[PDB]
């Protein structure tokens, strides 16, 4: 648990539709 | 309708190319975007680019040549200059 949140926290940029 | 979110990670000297470290559709896309807000990660809406990345570049894969320049442009907009 927390892998998703930790990945987002360290992210550079999110692309969405 | 189908929500999509692609999470791109690039760290000079670690990642040789930008990496798709997380993806999501539907409920998981919504959660990715909530977390993006929480951590102040830039979110860019680009529907053709999101769909194409989602189809082509799976979680844990580096971007491929078709994406190099469009993703560079996002990185330039998004990078924290730390001052």
Resolution in A: 1.6
Contact of B2 with B55, CB cutoff 8 Å = no
- Structural domain for B22, as ranges: 1-83
Burial B11-49 (b: 16+ CB within 10 A, else e): eeeeeeebbbbbbbeeeebeebbebbeeeebbbbebeeb
CA distances from B61 to B13, B38, B40, B82 (A): 17, 25, 24, 27
**C-alpha B52 chain-centroid distance:** 12
Asked if A13 has any chain B CB less than 8 Å from its own CB, the reply is yes
CATH code, domain carrying B69: 3.40.1690.10
Cα–Cα distance measured from residue B63 to residue B75, given in angstroms and rounded to the nearest whole number: 13
How was this model experimentally determined?
A: X-ray
Question: Of B19, B26, B35, which to mutate for an interface test with A (greatest number of A Cβ within 10 Å)?
Answer: B35
Cα–Cα distance measured from residue B8 to residue B23, given in angstroms and rounded to the nearest whole number: 9
What number of other Cβ atoms are within 10 A of residue A2's Cβ?
7
Number of domains forming the structure of chain B:
1
């Amino acid at each position: 648990s927390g892998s998703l949140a930790n990945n987002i926290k360290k992210s550079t940029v999110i692309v969405k539709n | 309708p189908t929500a999509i979110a692609i999470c791109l990670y690039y760290k000079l000297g670690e990642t040789p190319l930008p990496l798709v470290i997380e993806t999501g559709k539907d409920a998981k896309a919504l959660q990715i975007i909530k977390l993006a807000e929480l951590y102040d990660i830039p979110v860019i809406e680009d529907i053709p680019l999101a769909r194409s990345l989602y189809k082509n570049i799976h979680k844990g894969q580096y971007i491929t040549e078709d994406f190099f320049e469009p993703v560079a442009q996002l990185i330039r907009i998004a990078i924290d200059l730390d001052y």
